[PDB]
Design a protein around this nucleic acid. Sequence first.
DNA 1: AAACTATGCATGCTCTACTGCTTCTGATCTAGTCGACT
Length: 84
Amino acid sequence: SWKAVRVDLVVAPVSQFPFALLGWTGSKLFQRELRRFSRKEKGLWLNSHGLFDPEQKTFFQAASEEDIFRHLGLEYLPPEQRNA
DNA sequence: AAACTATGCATGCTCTACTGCTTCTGATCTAGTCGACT
């Protein structure tokens, strides 16, 4: 016998790997809140591809996912604690 | 010598193909709107 299970596949470059990983691990509400905080408080645009500064037209990529929280002035969280 | 017949020719008409130019039509590429998803 067999069963039908939904599977989602995403391909991203190594440079953008942490950004996509963060975008997909966190909950929908958590991602929305993080994006709103980034754009309103820190004034930076956050999406699944990278972090952008409208003032200085240069990407703020980083080699580790924790750098995203580090540069946004937020304490680091693990995926288990990002449940909305 | 005159009447009838014969050939001969020309021109307008009809059709079928042939070629080239012009216009219409069918196939192929994108903006917007709604919807689906992560």
